[PDB]
């Protein structure tokens, strides 16, 4: 899952390690509600913000989109690895049971918080697609999956630094 063939992105934010992975995973989950909005998602239910005890989270949202021109994103987030010396993995599990094939797959979405020189923060994000059932569009689903988490993942990066730009 976390290999080249499935890397996102690898970038930069000006921010300390704590900073930026509290910002998006903490107690004020205005800013993860905020990239959401950034991304074109609506219907957005609200995100817990018990994440750092609990060490999961579930929330949802509607993303608009062969297929319908839009579905329900069932979201399950879990706290893999936290440690501020050394680096911070979330798990986001992404369930589409309105979709075509949408009950044999889920999408797992990787980000690695690492870091960077002179105190800021390297964000690592991988993308893949688990599949539990056989499929006959299966290229088409991972592709189409893939470039939408390219794309919102570098919405999330630039609004991101908008939030730190104080």
């Given at each position: 899952?976390?290999?080249?063939?499935?890397?996102?992105?690898?970038?930069?934010?000006?921010?300390?390690?704590?900073?930026?992975?509290?910002?998006?995973?903490?107690?004020?989950?205005?800013?993860?509600?905020?990239?959401?909005?950034?991304?074109?998602?609506?219907?957005?239910?609200?995100?817990?913000?018990?994440?750092?005890?609990?060490?999961?989270?579930?929330?949802?949202?509607?993303?608009?989109?062969?297929?319908?021109?839009?579905?329900?994103?069932?979201?399950?987030?879990?706290?893999?690895?936290?440690?501020?010396?050394?680096?911070?993995?979330?798990?986001?599990?992404?369930?589409?049971?309105?979709?075509?094939?949408?009950n044999i797959f889920s999408?797992?979405?990787?980000?690695?918080?690492?870091?960077?020189?002179?105190?800021?923060?390297?964000?690592?994000?991988?993308?893949?697609?688990?599949?539990?059932?056989?499929?006959?569009?299966?290229?088409?689903?991972?592709?189409?999956?893939?470039?939408?988490?390219?794309?919102?993942?570098?919405?999330?990066?630039?609004?991101?630094?908008?939030?730190?730009?104080?």
């Open positions: 899952a976390m290999d080249n063939d499935h890397l996102v992105i690898e970038a930069n934010i000006n921010a300390p390690l704590g900073k930026v992975v509290n910002l998006l995973y903490g107690e004020d989950v205005s800013y993860y509600e905020r990239i959401l909005k950034a991304q074109k998602n609506f219907e957005i239910s609200p995100i817990p913000n018990n994440f750092l005890t609990k060490k999961i989270r579930d929330y949802a949202y509607t993303k608009p989109l062969i297929g319908p021109s839009k579905t329900k994103c069932l979201i399950t987030d879990t706290l893999e690895h936290y440690d501020l010396e050394d680096y911070v993995k979330v798990l986001s599990i992404t369930k589409n049971p309105d979709v075509p094939s949408g999408v797992k979405t990787v980000f690695l918080f690492s870091w960077d020189k002179n105190n800021s923060t390297k964000l690592t994000v991988y993308n893949s697609v688990d599949w539990t059932g056989k499929s006959w569009i299966k290229s088409m689903i991972e592709k189409g999956t893939f470039d939408g988490v390219a794309d919102t993942t570098k919405i999330m990066i630039s609004e991101i630094k908008k939030i730190l730009s104080d």
